[PDB]
Design a protein around this ligand. Sequence first.
Ligand SMILES: CC(=O)O[C@H]1CC(C)(C)C(=C=C/C(C)=C/C=C/C(C)=C/C=C/C=C(C)/C=C/C=C(\C)C(=O)C[C@@]23O[C@]2(C)C[C@@H](O)CC3(C)C)[C@](C)(O)C1
Ligand code: KC2
Ligand code: KC2
Ligand SMILES: CC1=C(C#C/C(C)=C/C=C/C(C)=C/C=C/C=C(C)/C=C/C=C(C)/C=C/[C@@]23O[C@]2(C)C[C@@H](O)CC3(C)C)C(C)(C)C[C@H](O)C1
Lengths: 188, 47, 179, 193, 193
Amino acid sequence: VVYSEALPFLVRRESLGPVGALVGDVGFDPLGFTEILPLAWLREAEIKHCRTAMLATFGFAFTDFWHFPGFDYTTLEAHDAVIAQGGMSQLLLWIGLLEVFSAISIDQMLRGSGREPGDYGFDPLGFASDPAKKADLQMKELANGRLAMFAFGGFVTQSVLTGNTFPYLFDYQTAGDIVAIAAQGASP
Amino acid sequence: MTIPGLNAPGLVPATKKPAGAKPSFESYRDTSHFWSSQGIMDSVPKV
Amino acid sequence: VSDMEGTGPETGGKVFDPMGLSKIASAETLAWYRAAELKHSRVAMAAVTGWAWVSSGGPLFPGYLSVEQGVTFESLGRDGYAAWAAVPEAGKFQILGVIGILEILSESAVKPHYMAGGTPGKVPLLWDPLGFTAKLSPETLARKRLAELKNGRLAMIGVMSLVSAHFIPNSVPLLPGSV
Amino acid sequence: ALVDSMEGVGEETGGQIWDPLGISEAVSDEAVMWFRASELKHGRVAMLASVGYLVGAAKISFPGELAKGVTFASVAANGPYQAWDAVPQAGKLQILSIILALEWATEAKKPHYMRGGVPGKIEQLPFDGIQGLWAPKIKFWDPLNFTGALSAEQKARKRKAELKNGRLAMIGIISFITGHNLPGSVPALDSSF
Amino acid sequence: ALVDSMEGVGEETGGQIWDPLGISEAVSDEAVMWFRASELKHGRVAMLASVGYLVGAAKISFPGELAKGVTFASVAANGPYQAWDAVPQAGKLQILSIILALEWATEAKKPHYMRGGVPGKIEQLPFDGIQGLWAPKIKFWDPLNFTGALSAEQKARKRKAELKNGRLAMIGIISFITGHNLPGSVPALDSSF
Ligand SMILES: CC(=O)O[C@H]1CC(C)(C)C(=C=C/C(C)=C/C=C/C(C)=C/C=C/C=C(C)/C=C/C=C(\C)C(=O)C[C@@]23O[C@]2(C)C[C@@H](O)CC3(C)C)[C@](C)(O)C1
Ligand code: KC2
Ligand code: KC2
Ligand SMILES: CC1=C(C#C/C(C)=C/C=C/C(C)=C/C=C/C=C(C)/C=C/C=C(C)/C=C/[C@@]23O[C@]2(C)C[C@@H](O)CC3(C)C)C(C)(C)C[C@H](O)C1
């Protein structure tokens, strides 16, 4: 009897596949989406979300500090401002070309071409060319991206909630004492 | 125009406010694209 | 510790360690003790020589120290502590930073480390660029290393006498009350 | 591992495992290892804390500036308890950052104190063998290698001394905190505390 | 490993590879070739920039005019930092176009460095072998063939010197720019630069 290594009180499901066909298989699937959707589709979505979240959190943090001379907008209003300007239309156009090609690849992979879940073959610099390092780098990619999703969510939500630029921390957290030991009052 | 790097700076420092109180929930919900009437009316394509 | 050099006729051929700090010292601890002794001795030798030259009346550096900001070698004065107070903070930071870079190079670049089975006090770049102590035999080189240790121990006591005269006034004789 | 083989049984409690409650009997072996690791952590933390609190109460402070415009005397003048609040936020942020690094590194070593490691024996060079991280090989414990000049029996005796000093240190630091909070709870603590 | 067979190892880090974070250990060999090529390109660009920035800081300039209205002294007057901004647009475009030609011709060599060729050994004649394109055969590096007089061991020692000087200039030029940006960040730079 195989128990999920992330939830040892649940039996592995079945649709998750052999234990370890996918880097990161810690058997984390309490809600059993693998029964409804195919694992290859789900993993392609996973890596797409990972990569997009990575780029998004880095771009948010970067735009909090630096912007190009033309774009004089803050990170929150940049979306509206550059839709009005027209740049986001260009991003949508080019990412849509790339995404049409990507969707063709997902169709082929699901119909049985042989392509892996998120293997676009993008490897110019030669990272992970050695097969020994490839699985470890896939696992590192997944770990970093799954962290980056929460990173970007916290970035945006705390940014709007606080109104502060980089740290996304309230004024009392930034200025006052977050490691105090003398008895506090009613407000921070 | 301003070619970034040739006839202008490259990356330009952003304008920032030095900390501040929490904006009220109704301050940004009433301007959000999905939970504001005017925000919804402005969250449409253009051509 | 008995086979670590630094002993001489001044102790009587025996190790001077009354408090017994050598008993609780391993090979690595003893190497650390010798490395710290060598570094402190060298620093104190340089410090005493500089302070004596500056305060005694020797011909100090000509020219300006900072053309802009108008600080001059003559203007800094001959009191050592006042001179180190009046030298620019940029100059102080620069001296400290270069010393730090040299310390980190001494720690890392000398790969057989003095703690991990190496020679204590073997800062590789900062020694004999002109090759003077190149043809000396091991016997005279050991004699000169013992000379380094002895002279620098005296120099440490000298510089502490100087700062004691500056802080606790009229403390050490043969040091005028000011400094 | 098991309480019979573990150290710490002193003379103060009659050459016997001092477990008035049935905690050791009720719990399993790896729970005992966790308790021993936590006991040593508490004793060491409290030893450092007690010495630092006594220094702060005595008002002995380094000659210089804790921060530009903030002197060690300035933060220490009000007392030991208030000095931590008087410290600027960035300094104790750095302290808690390095403590986070130390704790995570010590926990990341694979022969874990719960899973076949000596409980209380913190791995020296905790930042070694970690990819994407380089630190100088300065041992966490005994960087000067003081314990190298000790025998196994002497080291066991000094481990017993460690435990029996750490327990006193926990008692003392809680005494200091309780005396400051509720005055009169702990006598021998004058207004300086 | 390809990282074990290069000239960049220097006694300044002992007789051992300087990879504190294991970046070279976490990548395949092709990325190591790319790393060496980019390292040497960065180093060389950095030393060009460092000596140029020192020359600009000294207010040294050619006798003549960089355009028909600007003087070399005039465009150098403000300082090295604003000198590039004050350069005329067409000159900047021409520098960028010739650098484009160089880094396209050097890239378009089929032995390459990522795919089975010496990293950092830019092909001495980038624009030769290009069909329907003509260049005067001024070989890019050693146009007057200094290194021909050297033996193999001599040029190996000088390749080590190249790596050392390129890394030092990598530090130095950024020191110049950072000192200009943050005053006092690099105290060795006066207000002139
Ligand atoms: C009664 C009373 O209270 O008195 C007071 C007053 C009094 C006595 C003044 C006091 C004091 C202070 C004192 C006495 C301080 C002493 C300081 C001292 C002893 C300072 C040494 C420096 C050595 C240096 C810089 C050597 C460099 C040497 C070098 C660079 C070399 O060795 C190089 C080289 O040689 C080699 C290795 C190889 C050879 O081929 C030749 C060469 C050149 C190539 C006290 C303590 O306050 C007490
Ligand atoms: C756990 C121990 C500890 C370690 C290992 C450690 C290491 C490093 C390193 C690494 C090599 C650097 C480079 C560095 C730098 C600075 N540290 Mg720091 N530090 C530690 C502790 C404290 C405390 C308690 C304070 C403090 C501070 C500063 C300031 C002052 C800035 C200022 O003048 O405002 C600067 C620049 C003070 C502060 O932030 O004051 C607002 C302050 O109170 N640090 N610190
Ligand atoms: C290494 C880089 C480089 C190369 C290889 C290169 C080659 C050639 C060739 C041959 C192939 C010709 C025929 C040519 C001609 C002119 N160059 Mg040019 N040039 C380079 C760099 C610069 C810079 C930095 C500037 C510049 C300029 C001019 C002007 C002045 C016009 C004037 O008087 O306004 C004229 C006529 C200046 C400029 O653009 O001035 C507006 C200016 O600042 N060039 N340049
Ligand atoms: C990687 C990946 C994916 C992804 C992705 C993502 C989100 C990528 C995002 C990329 C991004 C965000 C790229 C921005 C570029 C910006 C440029 C070039 C700006 C030009 C700007 C120009 C030409 C001009 C600007 C001006 O201001 C100037 C200088 C002068 C002013 O007068 C006004 C104007 C406006 C004219 C998929 C496809 C979704 C799935 C796949 O699985 C994995």
